[PDB]
Structures are given as structure tokens and as C-alpha cells.
Amino acid sequence: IHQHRILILDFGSQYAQLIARRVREIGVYCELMPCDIDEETIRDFNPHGIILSGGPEAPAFIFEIGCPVLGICYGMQTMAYQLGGKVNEFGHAQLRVLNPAFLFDGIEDQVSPQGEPLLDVWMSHGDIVSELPPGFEATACTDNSPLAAMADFKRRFFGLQFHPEVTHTPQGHRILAHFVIHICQCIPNWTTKHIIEDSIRDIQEKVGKEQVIVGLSGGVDSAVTATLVHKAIGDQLVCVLVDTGLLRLNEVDEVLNVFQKHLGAKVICVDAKDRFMKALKGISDPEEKRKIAGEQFIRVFEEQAKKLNVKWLGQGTIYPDVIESKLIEPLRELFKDEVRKLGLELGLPADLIYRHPFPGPGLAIRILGEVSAEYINILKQADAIFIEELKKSDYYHQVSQAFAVFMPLKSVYGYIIALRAVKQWADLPHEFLSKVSHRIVNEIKEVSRVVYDMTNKPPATIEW
Amino acid sequence: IHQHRILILDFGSQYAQLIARRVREIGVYCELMPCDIDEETIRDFNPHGIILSGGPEAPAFIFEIGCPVLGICYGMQTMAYQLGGKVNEFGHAQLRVLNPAFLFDGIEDQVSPQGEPLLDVWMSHGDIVSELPPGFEATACTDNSPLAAMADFKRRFFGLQFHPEVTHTPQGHRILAHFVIHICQCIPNWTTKHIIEDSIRDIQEKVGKEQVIVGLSGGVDSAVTATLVHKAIGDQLVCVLVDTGLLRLNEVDEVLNVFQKHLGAKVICVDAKDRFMKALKGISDPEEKRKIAGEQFIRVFEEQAKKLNVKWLGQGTIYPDVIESKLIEPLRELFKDEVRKLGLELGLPADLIYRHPFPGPGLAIRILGEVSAEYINILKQADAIFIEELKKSDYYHQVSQAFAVFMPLKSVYGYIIALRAVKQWADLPHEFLSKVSHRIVNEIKEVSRVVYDMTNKPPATIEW
Numbered sequence: 001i002h003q004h005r006i007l008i009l010d011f012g013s014q015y016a017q018l019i020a021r022r023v024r025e026i027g028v029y030c031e032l033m034p035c036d037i038d039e040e041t042i043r044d045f046n047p048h049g050i051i052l053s054g055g056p057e058a059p060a061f062i063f064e065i066g067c068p069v070l071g072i073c074y075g076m077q078t079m080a081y082q083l084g085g086k087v088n089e090f091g092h093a094q095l096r097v098l099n100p101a102f103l104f105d106g107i108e109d110q111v112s113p114q115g116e117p118l119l120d121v122w123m124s125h126g127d128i129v130s131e132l133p134p135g136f137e138a139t140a141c142t143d144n145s146p147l148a149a150m151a152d153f154k155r156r157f158f159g160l161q162f163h164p165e166v167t168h169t170p171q172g173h174r175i176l177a178h179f180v181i182h183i184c185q186c187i188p189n190w191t192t193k194h195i196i197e198d199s200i201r202d203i204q205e206k207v208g209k210e211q212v213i214v215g216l217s218g219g220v221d222s223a224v225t226a227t228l229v230h231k232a233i234g235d236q237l238v239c240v241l242v243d244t245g246l247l248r249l250n251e252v253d254e255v256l257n258v259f260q261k262h263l264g265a266k267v268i269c270v271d272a273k274d275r276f277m278k279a280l281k282g283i284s285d286p287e288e289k290r291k292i293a294g295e296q297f298i299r300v301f302e303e304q305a306k307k308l309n310v311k312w313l314g315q316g317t318i319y320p321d322v323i324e325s326k327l328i329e330p331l332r333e334l335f336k337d338e339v340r341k342l343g344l345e346l347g348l349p350a351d352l353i354y355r356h357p358f359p360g361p362g363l364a365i366r367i368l369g370e371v372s373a374e375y376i377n378i379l380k381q382a383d384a385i386f387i388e389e390l391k392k393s394d395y396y397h398q399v400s401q402a403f404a405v406f407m408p409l410k411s412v413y414g415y416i417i418a419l420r421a422v423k424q425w426a427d428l429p430h431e432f433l434s435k436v437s438h439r440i441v442n443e444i445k446e447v448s449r450v451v452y453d454m455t456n457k458p459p460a461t462i463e464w
Numbered sequence: 465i466h467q468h469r470i471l472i473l474d475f476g477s478q479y480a481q482l483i484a485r486r487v488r489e490i491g492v493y494c495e496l497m498p499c500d501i502d503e504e505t506i507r508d509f510n511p512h513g514i515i516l517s518g519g520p521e522a523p524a525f526i527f528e529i530g531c532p533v534l535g536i537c538y539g540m541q542t543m544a545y546q547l548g549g550k551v552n553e554f555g556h557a558q559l560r561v562l563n564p565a566f567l568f569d570g571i572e573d574q575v576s577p578q579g580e581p582l583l584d585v586w587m588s589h590g591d592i593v594s595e596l597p598p599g600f601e602a603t604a605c606t607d608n609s610p611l612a613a614m615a616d617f618k619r620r621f622f623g624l625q626f627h628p629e630v631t632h633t634p635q636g637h638r639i640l641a642h643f644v645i646h647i648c649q650c651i652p653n654w655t656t657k658h659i660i661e662d663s664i665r666d667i668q669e670k671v672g673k674e675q676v677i678v679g680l681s682g683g684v685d686s687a688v689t690a691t692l693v694h695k696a697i698g699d700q701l702v703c704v705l706v707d708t709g710l711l712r713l714n715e716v717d718e719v720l721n722v723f724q725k726h727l728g729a730k731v732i733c734v735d736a737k738d739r740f741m742k743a744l745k746g747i748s749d750p751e752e753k754r755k756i757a758g759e760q761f762i763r764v765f766e767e768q769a770k771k772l773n774v775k776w777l778g779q780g781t782i783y784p785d786v787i788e789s790k791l792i793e794p795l796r797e798l799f800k801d802e803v804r805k806l807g808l809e810l811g812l813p814a815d816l817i818y819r820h821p822f823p824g825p826g827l828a829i830r831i832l833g834e835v836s837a838e839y840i841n842i843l844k845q846a847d848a849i850f851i852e853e854l855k856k857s858d859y860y861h862q863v864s865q866a867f868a869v870f871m872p873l874k875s876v877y878g879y880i881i882a883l884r885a886v887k888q889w890a891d892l893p894h895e896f897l898s899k900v901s902h903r904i905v906n907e908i909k910e911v912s913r914v915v916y917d918m919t920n921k922p923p924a925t926i927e928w
Contacts, residue, residue, distance in 0.1 A: 286876070368873050407880075409832050409871055411928040412750070416871075418915055427894040434889075437918040449924040451882055451915040454901040460913040464875040 001198050004186040006030040007047035009037075009062075011074050013054030017320060018165045019072065019176075021335050023051075026177050027188025029333075032323055035059055049184030051075070055127060058082060068156035070103075070179050073124040076150065076159030083157075085133035089125035092168065093148075094118055099139045101151055103158050103178050107171050122168035123148070124161060156183060192341050196228070199330045203232035206328060207312055213305050214314035216241040216255050216267065219358050220348075221316030221331060224339050226259060227346045228330050229314050237314075238266045240304050245273040245376060246293060246362030249384040258352065272300055280364065280371050289371065293361045356401045365463050369408040375415075378447065379406040382417045382440045389436050399426045404440075405464050414448035422462055425454050465662045468650035470494035471511035473501075473526075475518020475538050481784065482629045483517050483536070483640075485799050490641045491652025493797075496787060499523050513648030515539070519591060522546060532620035532647050534567075537588040540614060540623030547621075549597035553589040556632065557606045558582055565603050565615055566647050567622050571635050586632035587612070587625055620647055656805045660692070663794045667696040670792055671776055677769050678778040680705040680719045680731065681761075683822045685780025685795055687722070688807040692794050693778050694729060695810070702730045702772065706764050709737040709840060710757065710826035713848045722816060736764055744828065744835050753835065757825035820865045829927055833872040843870040845908045846881045853900050863890045868904075869928050878912035884928070888920050 006023050010016040010032055023030045031045065035052075039061050049067050052059060055074025062069060063083065071079035080087045097104050097117040110118040119140075129147050132138065136157070140149030150159035158179065164172030180186050203212075214226040216239050230237045239259055243252055252269075259265040279296050283289055301313060317329040318339060331339055343353045363379060364371050383404040390396035402421040409416050417440055421428065437450045453460075470487050474480040474496055487494045495509065499518065503525050513532045516523065516539030526533060527547065535543035545551050561568050561581045572581040583604075593611055596602060600621070604613030614623035622643065628636030644650050667676075678690040680703050694701045703723055707716050716733075724731045743760045747753055765777060781793040782803060795803055800821075807817045823829055830847075831839050846868040854860035866885040873880055881904055885892065901914045917924070 368875065407871065407873055409873060411832070412925045419918075425898075430891040433918050434920070438920070438923065441919060441923045449917065449919045449928070452918050453913065453915050454883075454897050455905060455913045455915075456898070456902070459902065459905045461876045464913070 001189055001194055002029055004028055004189065005045070005047055006049050006051060006180055006184065006186065007042065007045055008032045008051045008053060009035045009059055009075075011035050011052065011054035011078075012056030013074075014056075015163055015165050016053045017323070017335070019051055019053050021337060022165050022173055022176050023180055024190055024335060024338065025173070026180055027190050028180055028186045029190045031333075032319075048186050049180065051179070052079060055124070063155070063157065068179070068183050069158070071150075071157075071159040072163060072165075073127045073161060076129060076161055077127045079157060079159050080129045080133055080150070083133035083135075085136070086130040088128040088130060091123060091125065093121055093123040093142050093144070093162070095121045095123075095140050095142050095148055095162065097140050097149075099137065099151070101139050102153075102183050103139070103149075103151065103175060105178065107174050107178070109171060120168075120170055121162035121164075121172075122166050124163065127161060129159070129161070158183075192338070192345055195334070195338070196231075196342060196345065199228055200232045203229055203328060203330060207233060207236070209236070210312065211236045211238055211308070211310045212312040212314050212328065213238050213240055213301065213308070213310050215239075215301060216259055217244070217247065217251075218316055218360075219355060220343060220353060221318055221339055223255075223258070223348055223352060224343045224346065225314050225316045225330055226265075227263075227348060228342070229328075230263070230265065231346070235266075238268065238308060238310065240268045240270060240301065242270040242272045242297070242300050244276045244293070244297070244362060245373065246276060246364050246371075248358070248363075249380045254352075258349065263347075268304065270300060270304065272296075275300070277371075277373050282370065284370050286365065286368075289364045290361050293364045354397065356399075356403075359463060366403060366405045367408075368405065368464065375406055375408065378415065378444055379404060379417075381444045382406070382447070382450070385439050385443065386419060386436055389432065389439075393432060395428060395432065399423055399428075401462060402426075411449050414446050417447060417450040418453055418464075419450060420453045420462070420464070422457065424457055425452075465653065465658055466493050468492050468512050468648075468653065469509070470513050470515060470644060470648065470650070471506065471509055472496045472515045472517060473499045473523055473539075475499050475516065475542070476520030477518045477538075479627055479629050480517045481787065481799070483515055485801060486629050486637055486640050487515075487644055488654060488799060488802060490637075490644050491654050492644050492650045493654045495797075512650050513644065515643070516543060519588060527619070527621065532643070533622070534643050535614075535621075535623040536627060536629070537591045537625060540625055541591045541593060543621060543623050544593045544597055544600075544614065547597040547599070549600070550594040552592045552594060555587060555589065557585055557587040557589075557608070557612075557626070559585045559587075559604050559606055559612055559626065561604050561613075563601070563603050563615070565617070565622075567603070567613075567615065567639060567642050569642065569646075571638050571642070573635055583635055584633065585612075585626035585628075585636070586630050588627065591625060593623070593625075622647075656802065656809050659798070659802070660806060660809060663692055664696045667693060667792060667794060671697060671700070673700070674776065675700045675702055675772070675774045676776040676778050676792065677702055677704050677765065677772070677774050679703075679765060679780075680723055681708070681711065681715075682780055682824070683819060684800075684807060684817060685782055685803060687719070687812055687816060688803050688810065689778050689780045689794055690723065690729075691727075691807070691810045691812060693792075694727070699730070702732065702774065704732050704734060704765065704768050706734040706736045706761070708740045708757070708761070708826065709837065710740060710828050710835075712822065712827070713844050715822075718816070722813065727811075732768065734764060734768065739764070741835075741837050746834060748834050750829065753828045754825050757828045761824075818861065820860075820863075820867075823927060830867060830869045831872075832869065832928065839870055839872065842879065842908060842910065843868060843881075846870065846904050846911070846914075849903050849907065850883055850900055853896065853903075857896055859890075859892060859896065863887050863892075865926060866890070875913050878910045881911060881914040882917055882928075883914065884917045884926070886921065886926055889916075889918055 008019050020030050020032045050062050050069045052071040052075030077087050108117040109120045112118050135152045136150045138147045139151040142148045148161040164175045260267045314328050318331045340353050367375050386404050399421045400423050405418040407416045440450050441447050472483050484496045516535045519538030541551050573584045574582040576582050599616045600614045602611040603615040606612050612625040628639045723729045743756050778792045781796045804817050827840050828835050850868050863885050864887045869882045871880040904914050905911050
């Protein structure tokens with residue numbers, strides 16, 4: 001496995017990760033490297049094909065290497081500049097195909113009165129190409145853009161002025177599948193079952209007969225590491241679960257049911273609850289909260305291990321956190337979709353797999369001021385109530401994330417709770433919200449009044 | 465004028481006031497006293513009839529006076545208990561009338577398969593009466609209550625197990641009108657025109673040729689007081705408008721336009737802004753904030769006057785203010801309904817009359833922490849934007865009250881703004897709220913994020 005692979009160069013752009021994800025969905029391995037990376041890397045990666053992406057809001061020698069190249073938006077611009085030819089805002093556009101090529105064979109959204117194939121696409125209007133380089137030809141155009149797609153054919157270089165990754169070009173996934181499977185000639189073996197097997201073999205070859213600790217604390221990625229490791233080395237896995245005090249009401253219990261009661265597993269419970277409240281005893285700065293919690297986390301995991309004489313630590317590091325810039329990281333090449341797909345296949349329960357993300361520092365965010373315990377206990381209840389409804393009204397999975405935050409401000413007196421749910425804040429029904437607010441204030445004394453965040457992904461962050 | 469009058473005894477109950485208001489709408493004066501008030505008062509008030517309200521969530525000798533007496537809910541119970549007879553949850557209930565009497569003559573919601581009159585009423589299921597007193601006969605029943613209404617006729621005592629004041633007994637106002645107009649034999653002379661004339665005369669009688677200071681700061685109550693005085697004594701009126709710094713963005717301008725520019729009127733403007741900020745420099749406690757404002761407000765008014773040599777101060781005190789327990793107070797027997805009706809007839813512009821209530825201490829509340837000036841200037845911007853929309857979307861007059869509040873906390877970093885809108889928090893559309901919030905965070909820098917209060921009148925207080 002791994003032997004068929006696509007290199008994606010990142011020129012910025014939200015959608016770089018997502019080119020990669022679409023490629024993994026097609027069934028082929030790929031890595032996402034920044035464009036400032038050097039030849040050697042790229043040479044030693046020796047890809048079947050390269051995809052240039054991006055531009056937010058020069059790559060060099062990759063046209064010498066034998067493989068095919070696909071430039072997306074800005075990727076098309078520099079592909080133009082760096083070969084011959086001249087060069088110089090996002091929306092839907094109706095693209096018209098001239099030469100259905102290799103990259104567009106089939107692939108039609110409409111046919112048009114004149115009998116020409118048309119694609120609905122999400123254009124990047126600013127990444128314009130004025131004149132074609134030598135060897136290229138117009139393979140697609142739009143009313144406002146004479147050359148919205150390029151193609152060499154002899155060198156197998158291709159350009160698009162739109163984003164095929166995004167759902168707003170419906171047939172985009174087929175276009176990418178045509179590049180990867182047909183033009184780059186990759187056979188799909190990046191499967192899930194094949195990932196599970198490759199990963200078990202890796203864990204076995206690296207760890208041998210000696211023990212591994214995995215922190216159950218941490219949601220889907222941890223659960224997947226623990227089970228993945230468990231399957232690889234059985235009794236050698238020793239699970240540790242630290243109650244930092246910063247976890248959701250029933251997390252400790254829910255986790256123990258899965259790993260201890262079901263499926264055997266040695267699980268060590270560490271208290272750490274008093275430890276974490278000290279160390280955060282002052283500390284209002286939310287950036288210093290994140291440091292202290294997390295430092296104190298790795299410390300606890302080092303103490304356990306420098307105690308059970310364990311040399312290896314298993315972490316749930318995934319690929320997105322890798323690309324943001326003695327351990328065993330089984331998921332470090334995987335995106336979140338994939339971890340979820342592995343999770344189901346490994347035998348974890350659905351409700352754990354598709355649970356809302358939970359931050360690393362946990363509830364140490366979600367309290368605005370100093371974190372205290374007096375405060376976590378009352379936050380735990382409002383949050384519990386909030387997600388209990390949602391579950392009872394099947395609204396839970398219609399939102400991407402949902403939680404309560406605690407403001408230590410007080411009103412007519414008692415503290416204020418803020419509710420956060422997004423999808424782009426979620427348009428939940430009045431009467432339902434009322435029932436959630438009504439309950440939080442009534443059941444939890446020492447509160448009075450709850451509020452709902454109405455601020456979107458662009459202007460404000462999801463977490464406070 | 466005042467020559468016909470109803471006494472209302474208050475035994476607790478949201479709807480005590482409201483009986484009063486209904487009686488006032490019918491055109492008859494009335495006062496609201498607590499049930500524990502003494503004989504003498506009552507004698508001195510010399511009513512033409514009495515209404516007993518009450519029961520939240522034993523008056524004595526009132527039955528000795530020749531005047532009629534109506535008991536609502538608990539009022540019916542105590543009336544029963546204090547005469548002969550025995551006694552012992554609120555909802556809709558279909559009342560069947562036996563004997564249309566004087567109190568139900570006409571007044572039918574539905575007839576009935578047996579040809580008998582039926583009323584939709586809003587029962588108090590708990591204030592039951594087991595056995596009629598001497599002189600009384602059952603005058604109405606429901607499936608669950610054999611005697612939901614009582615009547616003496618000889619003594620003109622009447623009881624109801626339901627609330628006629630409330631909108632959920634649609635015919636209730638007619639029943640009250642029948643008591644006040646027909647049984648108590650009163651004449652509806654409490655008209656707004658007569659109140660204006662009696663009030664102008666009362667001012668003239670009291671103040672004669674000497675001058676009066678009226679504060680223009682204070683919305684509808686102030687405005688009406690000032691116009692009323694202006695009509696009474698012309699150039700003798702001297703208006704004072706103090707800008708405390710706790711007033712809304714354009715309030716100074718709007719009042720000056722109506723009083724200084726339109727309709728002559730001597731208006732003195734006082735700066736007071738530095739003064740109020742000093743007074744409230746520390747002081748987080750919102751009970752103290754309320755106290756320091758108001759104190760400082762009265763002080764400012766005494767200094768003017770003890771300077772212009774004026775001996776009379778006019779105020780917008782209204783009857784609800786009097787109820788909760790050298791000056792001229794013309795509005796002190798009126799409810800808000802009536803003050804608004806007056807202002808309109810007196811020539812004040814509609815948009816001032818039906819303006820949302822603004823609190824006495826103003827923007828001193830609505831900043832949670834210590835009021836700073838740096839914080840009011842942020843809040844003024846937030847508030848302004850909020851109501852500008854609403855005006856634009858015609859949602860302003862579909863809510864009873866709307867305002868912003870400033871929380872000095874900060875999130876991912878700038879301060880947080882809560883928005884409050886009620887009528888029972890306002891079910892405004894997702895599209896519209898999003899517009900407001902986007903605008904508050906983009907236009908006011910140093911904000912970031914904004915929330916919305918989802919808490920009702922029963923659990924949380926309207927204002928913070």
C-alpha cells in the first residue's frame with residue numbers, strides 16, 4: 001500500500017485540505033505539502049500526479065518530473081506564468097466545454113440549445129489567464145472568461161479556473177476522479193480495511209512485545225487509537241483515563257462502559273481533579289489557560305509510564321493537526337472522515353463516533369473568567385440539560401456543535417449562561433429554545449437568565 | 465369630576481392592577497388599596513362599589529356599607545367565608561349561566577344544545593366555595609364547579625370563580641362594565657378630555673402666578689407633564705433637560721426638537737455628564753448604581769430652582785409608582801395607558817408617545833459592571849443599531865421593549881453585547897437577528913460577538 005500517491009501543493013486557500021480529502025475518498029493516498037517545500041521531498045515522494053491548489057482569500061521544477069499536473073485557480077495562474085503565456089471574487093458560473101478532453105469525458109450538468117456540454121461551477125474570477133502558454137489550448141470557457149480551462153495533453157498539464165473540490169461544482173468530484181484514476185493512472189487501494197491492516201502491522205513492527213499507554217480522555221480520536229492499538233497488541237495496551245475535572249458530565253462513565261465493561265481493557269483512572277484546579281487557580285488569560293491545562297496533561301501521562309515502566313505513548317494526533325505549523329501516532333495520516341470510518345469498522349458505537357467535537361483543554365474554555373470548580377459544577381448542569389434536549393428532539397445531529405458557556409457576570413441575582421450552536425449559528429425553533437432556557441434557570445439555582453450566541457464563523461470564532 | 469368611584473382591594477395577584485385599568489377604560493375613576501388597609505380610608509374614600517381581587521400565584525366591615533361588592537376568585541371565597549358558608553391551578557373553562565341576573569344580562573359566548581347561555585372564562589380552580597351563604601343563590605356553574613358564581617341581589621354582593629379582567633375571558637370587560645355602570649349606578653365621566661381640564665385647573669389653583677421647573681429627561685411621563693403645565697401656565701413653565709450621559713444617542717436632540725423648536729418653551733440644558741461619571745466611578749452594585757443616579761438627579765434639579773428662584777418642581781410620577789410602597793404631580797392618578805392617551809390629545813407626536821419605556825437611571829443599568837463612559841459610548845452604538853433596524857423592519861412596535869446591554873468580559877478579543885427584546889422574549893426572524901448582530905460586531909470595533917436573551921418575564925426580570 002501507499003505505493004500509489006498524489007502530491008497536493010498548498011498555495012493557501014481554505015480548500016487545500018479538501019482537495020486531499022476528495023482524493024482520499026476516491027481511494028488514493030495523498031499528502032498536502034506547502035509550496036515553499038523543496039525539490040528532494042517531492043522527488044523522494046515521487047508522486048503519480050501533482051495538484052496545485054489555492055491562493056487565499058511559484059513551485060518550480062515539478063514540470064520536469066514525468067508525472068501529470070492539475071492547477072486549480074491560482075494553481076492554474078502560476079502554471080501559466082511558469083511556462084509561457086500571460087496572466088493577471090468568487091461565484092457560480094456556467095462553464096461551457098470545448099474539447100471534452102480526458103479531464104471532462106462524460107461530465108455534464110446541462111446540454112444547452114446549441115448542443116454544447118455545460119458545467120455548473122464555482123469560479124475564481126480573479127485568477128485570470130490572458131494568453132495560453134506554448135503547448136496549451138482552451139479546453140473550457142465562460143461568458144466572462146475566454147479561457148477557464150487549459151490542457152497540454154502531451155505533457156499532461158491541466159488548469160481549471162474553478163474549484164472542483166467544493167460542492168458548488170456538483171460534478172467536481174468526477175473531474176478530480178478523472179485526473180487521479182485515469183490520467184495519473186492510480187489504482188485505488190486506500191480503503192479503510194486496508195488502512196486498519198496497515199496500521200496494525202505498523203503498531204506491531206514498532207512496539208514489538210512492550211507495553212503502550214493510551215489516554216482515553218479525548219473523544220473519537222483517542223477511542224480509535226485505543227481500539228486500534230488494542231487490536232494490534234492486546235494485553236500490552238494499558239488505557240489511562242484522567243478526570244481533569246474539565247470533562248462533560250457523564251464522559252468518565254460513558255468511556256468506562258465502552259473500554260472497561262465492553263471489550264475487556266485495562267483502564268487506570270487517575271483523579272487529577274484537585275491538581276488541575278490548582279495550577280489554574282489564578283489565570284484569566286485564555287491563552288495561558290490553554291497552556292497550563294495541557295502542560296499538566298502531558299505531565300500526568302509522563303508520571304504514569306514513569307511508574308508502570310511503559311516506554312511507548314499512543315496519541316490520537318491526526319493529519320490536520322500535523323499539517324498545522326516515545327510516541328506512536330496511528331492516525332497521523334488520516335483526516336477526520338477517515339478516523340470516523342475506521343471507528344465504526346473497528347466496532348465503536350455510532351453515538352461516540354458522530355459526537356460533537358470537544359476541545360483539548362475541555363471546559364477550561366467555556367468559562368470566561370478564572371476556572372474554579374464552583375463554576376464547572378454549574379456549567380456541567382446547564383450543558384447537560386442543553387444536549388439532553390436536542391437528543392430528545394432529534395435536533396442534535398442537525399447541528400455541527402452545541403454547548404453552554406459560563407459568564408461570571410451575574411444579573412437579576414445570579415450568573416449568566418450562554419448557549420452556542422452552529423452548523424452559521426443554528427436557527428433552532430423558538431419554543432424549543434424557550435424549553436431549554438426555562439429549564440436551565442429553574443433547575444439550576446444560582447443562575448438566572450441564559451443567552452444565545454448569534455455570531456457567525458467569519459466574524460467570531462466557534463469557541464469563546 | 466372624581467364624583468363616581470370604585471375601590472379595589474388588592475389580595476395579591478398579577479391582575480390586581482388591570483381590574484383598575486379595565487374600570488378606568490369603562491370611564492369610571494378607581495383606586496387600588498391593599499386589603500389590610502383600615503376602615504377610615506374607605507369611609508373617607510366613600511366608594512360607589514367595591515371589587516375584591518386577589519390570590520397571588522379577610523377585609524371585614526365592607527359589607528356594612530350600602531354599596532355593592534364584587535368578589536373575583538379569592539375575593540369570592542373570602543366574601544363567602546366572611547358571610548355564612550363553607551369553602552376549600554388556573555385554566556380555560558366553559559361557564560354555564562343560571563340566572564342572567566344584573567351581572568350577566570346579555571353577555572353570551574355560545575348558546576348550547578339545551579338553549580342555555582355559555583361563557584368562555586379563565587377559572588381559578590382552587591378558590592372553590594362548598595356551600596352558599598344566607599341570601600345567596602348560585603348564578604353560574606361549570607362541569608367541575610357547582611357554584612362558579614354567586615349573587616345576593618338584596619345586598620348586591622356578587623362572586624365569580626374566574627377572572628373577568630383577563631383577555632382569556634373574552635366577555636369579561638362587559639361583565640365588569642355591568643357591575644360598574646348598572647349595579648353601582650356610576651356614570652362614565654373619566655374621559656381623557658375631562659382629565660386634561662381638571663388637571664390644568666388643578667395646576668393653576670396650586671401654582672398661581674409663580675414658576676415651575678419640569679424635567680424633560682424621562683420620556684413619555686415627563687413630556688406629558690411638561691405640555692400639561694405649559695398649557696396651564698404658559699411662560700411660567702421653565703423646562704430643564706439634564707444630559708446625564710446615561711441617555712440614548714439622540715434623546716437630547718429629539719426632546720429639544722419637540723419642546724424648544726416646536727412649541728416655544730423655555731428649555732435650559734444642563735451638562736451634568738462629567739458629574740454623573742464621577743458619582744458612579746466605582747460602584748458595581750446595581751442597587752447602589754440606581755441610588756447614586758436619582759440622588760444626583762434630584763440634586764441637579766434642586767440647584768437649578770435654588771438659582772432661578774423657582775419654588776415648584778413638576779414630575780411625571782404615575783399611579784403605579786404611587787402604588788409600590790415642593791412638588792406637583794399631575795400624572796399621579798393615571799396608568800400608562802391613560803398617560804399615552806393624554807399626550808396624544810395634548811398634541812405630542814405619536815412616535816414619542818408609543819416609544820418603549822426607558823428606565824429612570826437609564827444606561828446605568830445595561831452596563832453590567834462599573835459604568836465608565838468608555839463603556840456607555842460602546843453601548844450607545846450597539847443600542848442605536850439595534851433599534852434602527854426594527855424601525856426599518858417594522859418590528860419595533862411588535863415588541864413591548866427592546867435594548868442592548870454591555871458585558872465587560874471579552875471573547876475571541878473584544879467585549880460582548882447582549883440584546884433584549886420582549887412582549888415572553890421576542891421570536892424575531894433568524895435573517896433579521898443575523899443582520900443586526902453582523903452589524904454590531906463589524907461597525908463597532910472592540911466588540912466581537914453578540915448574544916440574545918432567551919429568558920421570560922416569570923423567571924428573569926425584563927431589565928438586567
